[PDB]
Design a protein around this ligand. Structure first.
Ligand SMILES: *[C@@H]1O[C@H](CO)[C@@H](O[C@@H]2O[C@H](CO)[C@@H](O)[C@H](O)[C@H]2NC(C)=O)[C@H](O)[C@H]1NC(C)=O
Ligand code: MG
Length: 676
């Protein structure tokens, strides 16, 4: 139970050894211990960790990436944080500050005038130039000269003035000290404030540190990667890169990550920010920033399904990858790159393969084990598009992806130009039970289409989470019928399935499905969770079955969240959530291409086509609902709804989130770690 920490200096090793001793005192024989391995450099520490001679070292984003690469393959496991638990600030943001209404975007920086914090600085140079690399003119080695030919004039502190003078044009001599008024963060910002430069590459924090009044900040904007702008307040939605300020790494396989976290968590409990004055984890007696930055206020456990690329973010890896590999294609700037679609089953891959050949190369295919792994592929560029249900549209939204096309299921003349927004989830009750409203629901008897289902379970129980705030969903209702629950649960007591079918989510349960839950309402329930048309189609002699011949709509009302009851036809105003259609999800920087390609694609192999055997067709599956749901007639454009929050109702998001507090998704907890 020992963590072998790696030092990169004699002073660091000394701090590690006193950390070992102090951890010795307070900790029982069982549990964390510290070993102090000492190597010559961060690179050497990485190669030692990979070679199982050390276990943990804490690194700057660049070395995080270095450690990620073959043959080391280390991963982030714990993260220093630089404020409070309520506002960690484990990351910072590299941004491009500009004058308000200066009239240009990220893809128009050529010819403009630049202000950098310093050459080799991450936010001031590495990140922006990395992203801009391919826009630099062809003799891209040496980099300083290509940057010089890119901008008309620059201040690039610490650059080689004598050889590349345009980089000192705004700060002649390129002083690498505060002597140069345009050096550093405050200097790169004053370079812009003084109108010397058109753009300043700095950190999110910098505008706030140099301008106290909101008034003056309001004449500054930020360049976003999508070639829009935003106010400086909104850097979390308009940054060049998000960068983890200081990250502990361990081996991927066999890394002891849990030991590292146990150890550091206890260490911060005993010797952290101020809670002891004998020894301070975040204070170097012999140097500065030994083992850990002295800014740090504490540690946070990194979610277990984070890999380096996911942690750093696609922008950052683009930046370093460009600056190290230095490979730009010659592909024509305007044309779209073939969209690689993500398959999660053997038959999904076979369908996508046929599609690819018939797409004459416009579509390609990428297999991945699971849905979440596919989403990961979209985020990090290994894949471009896939179709998701509501819940995964939400997880992908929290991961920065966007919906772009909705699967439309209702045939119509011009369905490409009208998305559908889905059916309505409702909570039905019988008028004969007058005192029932959304609030007293607790302790009453209930009927669900089936556990897992969207209208029968997810939306209702998600909205009710707030009236319970724990994950024992069978304790809200006295008794119920929720097919799929465990048989000895109270949510199985009212199910009427015979033999082995008693509580099984299948037709033989008979209180299963929309019809079945409504039957459970009329026969033995107080409330039943279904969609808007279930009552109209099981009443008035529309259902011939014995129980359902003579029931009439008037007898039932449906429960509204405001605490009032409403009639069935008024579902549009009385509903719990809007149960959404499947939607094609992609990364923002590919939204356009996807839009275009898919549309072309659904003209050919789309529902219009007969002789589906003589030619390929995109919405017919050999098995069931491969790639797209087989109901799809078209893919409808999501103008004005191209964000997970907009595409999914406010109510639906409330419900799915609340649920996800009980059913964790490792991907979702990673993504929320990077963006709360
Ligand atoms: C439902 O079916 C048709 C599409 O073929 C459309 O129904 C329309 O409903 C509105 C409101 O009741 C009427 O005013 C229109 O006259 C109907 N049109 C037709 C053709 O029936 C509607 O577009 C479809 N709904 C969805 C979501 O696609
Ligand atoms: Mg001591």
């Amino acid at each position: 139970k020992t963590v072998r920490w790696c030092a990169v200096s004699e002073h660091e090793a000394t701090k590690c050894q006193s950390f070992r001793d102090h951890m010795k005192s307070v900790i029982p024989s069982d549990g964390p211990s510290v070993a102090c391995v000492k190597k010559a450099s961060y690179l050497d520490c990485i190669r030692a960790i990979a070679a199982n001679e050390a276990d943990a070292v804490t690194l700057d984003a660049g070395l995080v990436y270095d450690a990620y690469l073959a043959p080391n393959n280390l991963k982030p496991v714990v993260a220093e944080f630089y404020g409070s638990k309520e506002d960690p600030q484990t990351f910072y943001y590299a941004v491009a500050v500009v004058k308000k209404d200066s009239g240009f975007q990220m893809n128009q920086l050529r010819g403009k005038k630049s202000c950098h914090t310093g050459l080799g600085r991450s936010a001031g140079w590495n990140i922006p130039i990395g992203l801009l690399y391919c826009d630099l003119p062809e003799p891209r080695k040496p980099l300083e000269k290509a940057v010089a030919n890119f901008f008309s004039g620059s201040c690039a502190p610490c650059a080689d003035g004598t050889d590349f003078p345009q980089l000192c044009q705004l700060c002649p001599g390129c002083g690498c000290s505060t002597l140069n008024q345009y050096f550093g963060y405050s200097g790169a910002f004053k370079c812009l404030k003084d109108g010397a430069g058109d753009v300043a590459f700095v950190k999110h924090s910098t505008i706030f540190e140099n301008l106290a009044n909101k008034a003056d900040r309001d004449q500054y904007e930020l360049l976003c990667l999508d070639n829009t702008r935003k106010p400086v307040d909104e850097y979390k939605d308009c940054h060049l890169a998000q960068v983890p300020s200081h990250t502990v790494v361990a081996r991927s396989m066999g890394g002891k990550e849990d030991l590292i976290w146990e150890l550091l968590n206890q260490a911060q409990e005993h010797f952290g920010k101020d809670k002891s004055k004998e020894f301070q984890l975040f204070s170097s007696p012999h140097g500065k920033d030994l083992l850990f930055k002295d800014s740090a206020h504490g540690f946070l456990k990194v979610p277990p399904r984070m890999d380096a690329k996911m942690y750093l973010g696609y922008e950052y890896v683009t930046a370093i990858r460009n600056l190290r590999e230095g490979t730009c294609p010659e592909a024509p700037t305007d044309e779209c790159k073939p969209v690689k679609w993500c398959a999660l089953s053997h038959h999904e891959r076979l369908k996508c393969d046929e599609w690819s050949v018939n797409s004459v190369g416009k579509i390609e295919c990428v297999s991945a084990e699971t849905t979440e792994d596919c989403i990961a592929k979209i985020m990090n560029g290994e894949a471009d598009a896939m179709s998701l249900d509501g819940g995964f549209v939400y997880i992908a939204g929290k991961c920065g992806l966007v919906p772009v096309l909705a699967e439309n299921y209702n045939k119509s003349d011009n369905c490409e130009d009208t998305p559908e927004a889905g059916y309505f989830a409702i909570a039905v009750v019988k008028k004969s039970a007058s005192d029932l409203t959304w609030d007293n629901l607790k302790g009453k008897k209930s009927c669900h289409t089936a556990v897992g289902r969207t209208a029968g379970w997810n939306i209702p129980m998600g909205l009710l989470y707030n009236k319970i705030n724990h994950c024992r969903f069978d304790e809200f209702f006295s008794e119920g019928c929720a097919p799929g629950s465990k048989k000895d649960s109270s949510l199985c007591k009212l199910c009427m399935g015979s033999g082995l079918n008693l509580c099984e989510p299948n037709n033989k349960e008979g209180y299963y499905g929309y019809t079945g839950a409504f039957r459970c309402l009329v026969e033995k329930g107080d409330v039943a969770f279904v969609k808007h048309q279930t009552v109209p189609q099981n009443t008035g002699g529309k259902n011939p079955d014995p129980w359902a011949k003579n029931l009439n709509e008037k007898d039932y009302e449906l429960l509204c969240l405001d605490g009032t009851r409403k009639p069935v036809e008024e579902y549009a105003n009385c509903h719990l959530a809007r149960a959404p259609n499947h939607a094609v999800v992609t990364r923002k920087d590919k939204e356009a291409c996807v839009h275009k390609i898919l549309r072309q694609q659904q003209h050919l192999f789309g529902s219009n086509v007969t002789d589906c055997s003589g030619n390929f067709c995109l919405f017919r599956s050999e098995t069931k609902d491969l790639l797209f749901r087989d109901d799809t007639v078209c893919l409808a454009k999501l103008h004005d709804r191209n964000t997970y929050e907009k595409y999914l109702g406010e109510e639906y998001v409330k419900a799915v989130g609340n649920l996800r507090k009980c059913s964790t998704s490792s991907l979702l907890e990673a993504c929320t770690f990077r963006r709360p």
